[PDB]
Ligand SMILES: Nc1ncnc2c1ncn2[C@@H]1O[C@H](COP(=O)(O)OP(=O)(O)CP(=O)(O)O)[C@@H](O)[C@H]1O
């Protein structure tokens with residue numbers, strides 16, 4: 370089968386050959402949005418083009434966008450290591466039409482790439498699609514132009530309990546370009562728990578969402594009102610790792626060549642003996658988000674973007690501990706990461722020394738308190754009655770040992786114990802009040 374690298378290039382080559390302009394991935398740091406924490410979709414760099422405020426020399430584009438979903442609208446941090454299909458850092462393969470082709474040709478491009486003998490040659494019987502319930506045009510295309518049997522075409526309405534709140538209405542922000550979308554799913558087999566989309570068991574890893582094709586129609590305003598876009602457009606997004614899994618005949622994103630190699634590197638530097646566990650997969654994922662965030666200019670801190678980075682670094686170091694790592698390890702995975710990323714690893718390669726030093730410093734700093742915090746936590750979980758750790762202990766872990774609340778919660782989750790988050794937030798504010806009271810400002 371093709372390697373992840375070959376799949377990335379094949380996708381871009383397909384669209385370049387179909388008249389699309391190849392455009393480089395944008396940074397993980399949003400160029401001009403204070404609002405958005407990290408780039409979480411291929412659309413972000415084209416946002417103003419879809420709005421009609423910015424014009425390109427080209428009417429169609431294609432990119433492999435590095436994305437991080439670890440906060441805000443789309444936060445997948447707590448899915449990492451629990452689902453087959455979620456990363457913090459991942460690449461979104463996209464094709465974009467800026468007032469060019471619309472619904473029919475978008476759907477055909479996708480079906481061709483996925484099912485053509487000349488291209489990915491996936492079997493049609495394993496593919497399922499969804500459309501926005503009111504999108505009769507997309508439905509008819511799939512049914513009569515592509516020939517999907519009706520039993521594999523699923524209409525999805527406002528299933529998130531509000532107007533336009535739907536798995537088939539795509540909107541990356543509270544404002545900005547958005548629209549109904551049609552999505553292609555692959556059935557990984559009945560040995561896997563989960564139902565098709567539109568069932569209460571859709572969240573299972575059996576029917577995995579591969580490719581999301583958005584029909585950009587509206588600009589959503591702060592009033593929540595939908596203003597029509599000047600030109601109807603197309604924004605699609607396919608997960609590189611997810612399509613790599615399908616193509617390499619594996620069910621989990623972590624079973625693809627890239628992660629098999631990365632996970633091996635993780636086991637090597639930590640001394641882990643298991644070929645896979647939650648922690649090996651978590652660290653493999655985290656090095657990608659941490660290294661690439663640093664390479665894109667994000668520095669660890671206790672505020673905003675810097676804190677999300679710091680939080681991810683520290684969770685990876687904690688998982689390293691659980692594997693039994695005996696020396697500073699996390700920064701040692703930057704080399705191995707650069708290598709598995711191929712052409713998408715060249716920016717990181719340039720900044721390898723900087724990134725390794727940031728990660729080494731951060732891990733060494735946290736190591737001062739980690740084991741002692743873990744001992745305290747273990748001590749408090751042993752004397753705990755009930756399924757919830759009080760927010761006082763969580764605050765103590767934070768205040769003295771530098772455990773972010775989600776790191777503490779991550780440890781507790783593994784033992785079937787919850788963390789009283791409100792109790793933690795209350796403790797945090799009371800300290801803020803003490804700081805105001807004493808300082809006087
Ligand atoms: N955390 C993540 N890890 C890996 N791939 C992801 C991802 N989030 C999204 N993708 C991929 O990017 C594509 C387009 O993004 P979209 O915003 O539609 O994702 P989504 O959040 O609907 C997928 P899911 O329902 O599985 O979370 C998806 O079809 C999926 O293939």
Ligand SMILES: [Mg+2]
Nearest residue numbers: 438443444445
């Ligand atoms: Mg999601």
Ligand SMILES: [Mg+2]
Nearest residue numbers: 536552578581
């Ligand atoms: Mg989805």
Ligand SMILES: [Mg+2]
Nearest residue numbers: 536552578581
């Ligand atoms: Mg989607």
